[PDB]
Amino acid sequence: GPPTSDDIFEREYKYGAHNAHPLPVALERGKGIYLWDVEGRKYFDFLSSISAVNQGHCHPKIVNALKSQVDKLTLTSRAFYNNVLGEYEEYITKLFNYHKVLPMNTGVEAGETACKLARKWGYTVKGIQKYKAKIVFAAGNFWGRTLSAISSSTDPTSYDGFGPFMPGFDIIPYNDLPALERALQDPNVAAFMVEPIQGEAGVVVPDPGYLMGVRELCTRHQVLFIADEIQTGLARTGRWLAVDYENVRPDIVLLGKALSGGLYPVSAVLCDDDIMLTIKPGEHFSTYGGNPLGCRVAIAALEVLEEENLAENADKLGIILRNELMKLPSDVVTAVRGKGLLNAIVIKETKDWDAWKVCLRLRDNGLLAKPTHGDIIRFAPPLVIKEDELRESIEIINKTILSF
Amino acid sequence: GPPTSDDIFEREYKYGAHNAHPLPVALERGKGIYLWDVEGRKYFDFLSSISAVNQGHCHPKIVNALKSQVDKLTLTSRAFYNNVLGEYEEYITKLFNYHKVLPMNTGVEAGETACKLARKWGYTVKGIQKYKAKIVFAAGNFWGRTLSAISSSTDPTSYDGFGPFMPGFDIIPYNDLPALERALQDPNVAAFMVEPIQGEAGVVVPDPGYLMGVRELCTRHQVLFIADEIQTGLARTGRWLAVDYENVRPDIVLLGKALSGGLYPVSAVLCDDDIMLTIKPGEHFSTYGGNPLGCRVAIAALEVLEEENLAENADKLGIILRNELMKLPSDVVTAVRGKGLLNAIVIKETKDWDAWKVCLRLRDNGLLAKPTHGDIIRFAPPLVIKEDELRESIEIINKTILSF
Ligand SMILES: *Cc1c(COP(=O)(O)O)cnc(C)c1O
Ligand SMILES: *Cc1c(COP(=O)(O)O)cnc(C)c1O
């Protein structure tokens, strides 16, 4: 017969690095909100690959765009032009209303690019002395696992044993305007990079007015506001960008994950000419960045979000999810939080009972989720989920939680 | 009618960052060794997307692998297991003969991962005090454009305006064994990262015995030998790895680019257990790393290389290429170099005549190549090229050079 789930776990243990920490389920097929394991068991996906399959697994519009282009041309590198990139660039810049886009592959690559842009703008436009430029980050931040990314992390698991660390990165508390105002007194700060909602920190939602205050302070002190929307963007929270909730325009926007609906690693840095054009020809590139195959899948992925009105559906259904979760006993679920379909519960963890064990039983009962911490479980289904499917999922969540 | 080449160039100028320095040609289709522009003009590909399409453009076996998996499952993230990754891991580890592989997406991500491995091994196994670990690099090195990668560069265009820089990165001359020996006297050195041939530096091949000497020095001093085979590996130089020419076994091998045949961003870090397992569960992973779609194309990409005996081809045909190139007048072309089908020519550059000019005329005569420097031109056609195809290309190169 074919490999069992245990066969699959065992082979990876033998031949693969032990760098990940997966929930033990072994998936072989996905469609829409559903995943199937190698034994044929069916599950509601409530993780969406960390919000990278907002459009559902294997969306036929995005699949078709990939299959069509793969027969024509997949990669020239940046040594030559391809015919598709410009069409994607015009589309995405007009959608989000920035002059320009710089295409990258992974989320961390887009963050690296934003730091370089901020620094280069800092030195060549603002006039900071080389090499004294600072970038300010919020505690709890996550933007990937390069050496530079972990240098700004407050999570010991990401940075311990991996230094020495990149200089010029400062850390302040999240959701803390007085602290930003204090940090921005230093003329050498070029940018503040921040998530509108912190995903990996446990879906930490800042108070109303935070984002307007950040925009105000950054403008006041001539500092770039970089909004990392790699997890929160693209209809996930109920808008094109989570910053749309307070109608503020960051200087640089980062996109990734669901930019391709899961079909291809595509990320993007959006900003106006006065920031973008600080990087000159030859000063920054990658092999796969802007390749025609990725661009065709990103165009289709973005069109799906628009056409199916997934932002509106995420807004409507998320409030149902939160309100239903809030009905669970307080001696069990101590907090419910989120926006749109990016949500989390906090459980009253004991020594015998934690998020991991809850998630294992969830899995056994046909729903896949994963903790961010011993007491925090993230809930993020694909945005194509219908209300009846959500309520079926809610029933599974209730039954599971109350069975301990 | 459709866009012209100028249309395509102008749309990117308006809506895309000005960060690439491309040769002006607008490609829409690629099959095997051939590329077609938007006017329908046909070119020999003599760059292979910087050795990323060793297997030719749109190889039907790798295309089939993509089309087959895209309908099943494309992305779970590493929060869950997929059924394909382990099959890929067993296959690639047994092929190159290392215990384990850590999957990443882009080349620079593989390099960052290797630096993290070297540091954590440095602290936990070698006993270096945190955070005093050093990694040594060679002048002329290229491994990408993250902040960390540019912090090891000797190219001002990569690092200027982007500081401050990552500490703990030391630089010595390439092809210099005494310099390495002197650097490795410092017990806080964890690793030496080096290309067996430097691609971007202009196909700089080190003297016979260099790699054997690097291996000896690293072993003596308990330092990890990291070989970056992202450009040189996968049959490009006429072996599975350029390092095979001297029977040398690095501690860490980096693969990327042609690992997917240009169909998907896939990179790999290969090393044994005592190094790999210094990273513990949850300490390093990315969203798209190890996804089933990428793994399916990577297995097919590798099988093509093996099945079609492309290393053997690259070796025989590269000997012909260099032989014919050396027949050119010694005052116009000053040096010919390379291994397999990674080759370059150095030209007697004048005020009015340079590599860029030669490559513009080459393009006009139906052959695509790109300068590495004002006086250096790289030639790297896909490895599926037959002898008669190569000879036709050679006459086009011959005619063009002597047409000035
Ligand atoms: C996932 C994530 C990233 C990193 O994306 P990768 O593609 O995994 O490198 C960056 N920022 C945020 C907010 C993310 O959620
Ligand atoms: C191209 C290259 C890389 C980086 O590859 P990307 O996928 O463009 O990040 C790293 N090392 C070497 C030697 C390379 O040629």
Helix/strand/coil (H, E, C) string of A91-107?
HHHHHHCCCEEEEECCH
B313/B386 Cα distance (integer angstroms): 8
Catalytic pick among A37, A45, A228, A315: A228
CA dist B367 and B389 (Å) reads 12
Q: Which of B142, B192, B225, B379 is catalytic?
A: B142
CB contact under 8 A, B85 and A16: yes
Nearest to A216 by CA among A180, A173, A270, A269: A180
Considering its fold, how many domains does chain A have in total?
Answer: 2
Q: Which residue, B265, B284, B308, sits at the end of a domain?
A: B308
Integer Cα distance of B51 and A209 in angstroms: 50
Question: Do B147 and A29 lie within an 8 Å CB cutoff?
Answer: no
Let me know whether B245 and B176 are in one domain: yes
A390: which residues sit within 8 A by CB, 6+ positions away? Answer: A317, A320, A321, A381
Say yes or no: A138 and A267 in one domain. Answer: yes
Q: Are strands B34-37 and A23-31 parallel, antiparallel or unpaired?
A: unpaired
Q: What is the DSSP string of B215-265?
A: HHHHHHTT-EEEEE-TTTTTTTTSSSSGGGGGT---SEEEE-GGGGTTSS-
Interface test with B, best of A10, A11, A14, A19 (most B CBs within 10 A): A19
Shared domain check, A131 and A87: yes
**Ordered alpha helix ranges (H), B56-185:** 60-69, 85-96, 107-121, 147-150, 156-159, 177-183
A367-368, strands of its sheet edge to edge: A367-368, A42-45, A34-37, A23-31, B80-82
B88 lies in the same domain as B200? yes
Yes or no, beta carbons of B262 and A74 under 8 Å apart: yes
DSSP string covering B282-317: TSS--SSTT-HHHHHHHHHHHHHHHHTTHHHHHHHH
What phi-psi label fits residue A355: left (phi over 0), alpha (psi between -120 and 50 degrees) or beta? alpha
Q: Say whether both B77 and B50 belong to one domain.
A: no
User: What is the whole-number distance in angstroms between the Cα of residue A111 and the centre of ligand 1?
Assistant: 8
A–B interface: beta-carbon pairs under 8 A: 382
Backbone angles phi, psi at B53, to 5 degrees: -120, 60
| DSSP state for residue B107 in the 8-state scheme | H
Is residue A16 left, alpha or beta, with left meaning phi > 0 and alpha meaning psi from -120 to 50? beta
Q: What is the DSSP string of A196-222?
A: SSBTTTTSBPPPTTHHHHHHHHHHHTT
Q: Is the CB of residue A121 less than 8 Å from the CB of residue A278? A: yes
Tell me the C-alpha distance between B346 and B334, whole Å. Answer: 6
Q: Are residues A214 and A160 in the same domain?
A: yes
The closest alpha carbon to B382, from B215, B282, B257, belongs to B257
The three-state DSSP-derived secondary structure of A138-198 is ECCCCCCCCHHHHHCCCCHHHHCCCCCCCCCEEEECCCCHHHHHHHCCCCCEEEEEECCCE
B281:A20 CB<8 A: yes
Q: Which residue of A has its CA nearest to B285?
A: A20
Length of chain B: 404
Same domain, A28 and A154: no
CA of A256 to the centre of ligand 1 (A): 7
Question: For position A14, which CATH number holds?
Answer: 3.90.1150.10
Give the per-residue SS3 of A24-73. Answer: EEEEEEEEECEEEECCCCEEEECCHHHHCCCCCECCHHHHHHHHHHHCCC
Strands B134-138 and B169-172, by their bridges, are parallel
Q: Is beta strand B134-138 parallel, antiparallel or unpaired with respect to A42-45?
A: unpaired
A58·B50 Cβ contact <8 A: no
A44 contacts A33 by C-beta, under 8 angstroms: yes
Contact criterion met (CB below 8 Å) for B202 and B372: yes
Domain boundary among B308, B331, B355: B308
* Phi, psi angle pair for B11, to nearest 5°: -65, -40
Expt. technique: X-ray
Which of B59, B96, B162 should we substitute to test contact with A (largest number of A Cβ atoms within 10 Å)?
A: B162
Q: Any CB–CB contact under 8 A between B351 and chain A?
A: no
| Distance between Cα B365 and ligand 1 center (Å) | 44
What letter represents residue B393's amino acid?
S
Pairing of strands B367-368, B342-347: unpaired
**How many of the other CB atoms lie within 10 Å of CB of A304?**
23
Task: Determine whether the shortest distance from the Cβ of A143 to ligand 1 is under 6 A.
Answer: yes
Q: Please name the helix (run of DSSP H) or strand (run of DSSP E) that holds residue A338, with its range, or none.
A: strand A333-339
Q: Sheet containing B376-379: which strands, arranged edge to edge?
A: B333-339, B342-347, B376-379, B370-373
Active site residue B126: no
Q: What is the resolution of this structure in A?
A: 2.2
Q: Are residues B244 and B98 in the same domain?
A: yes
Cβ contacts of B131 on chain A, cutoff 8 Å: 163-165
Are A269 and A349 part of one and the same domain? no
CATH number for B90: 3.40.640.10
Residue nearest to atom 5 of ligand 2 (CA): B107
Domain residue limits at B7 = 1-58+309-404
Look at residues A308, A324, A343 and tell me which one is the last residue of a structural domain.
A308
Q: In terms of domains, do A129 and A258 share one?
A: yes
As given in the structure block, the two tokens for residue B181 are: 């020996």
Give whole-number Cα distances, B156 to A122, A211, B102, in Å.
18, 37, 31
Q: Would the CA dihedral through A292, A296, A302, A303 be positive or negative?
A: positive
Rg (CA), chain A: 21
Tell me how far CA of residue A399 lies from CA of A25, A324, A327, A373, A404, in angstroms: 20, 13, 13, 22, 9
Q: Which of A262, A342, A347 is nearest to A300 (CA)?
A: A262
Kindly list the distances between the CA atom of residue A10 and the CA atoms of A16, A26, B87, B273, in Å, as whole numbers in the listed order: 10, 11, 11, 16
Taking a C-beta distance cutoff of 8 angstroms, is the pair A18, B277 a contact?
Answer: yes
Amino acid letter at B207?
D
Torsion sign over Cα A93, A94, A96, A98:
positive
State whether B336 and B239 are in the same domain. Answer: no
Identify whether the C-beta of residue A159 lies closer than 8 Å to the C-beta of residue A153. yes
- Does one domain contain both A322 and A300? no
Nearest-by-Cβ selection for A28 from B72, B79, B120 = B72
Encoding tokens for residue A129?
């002395």
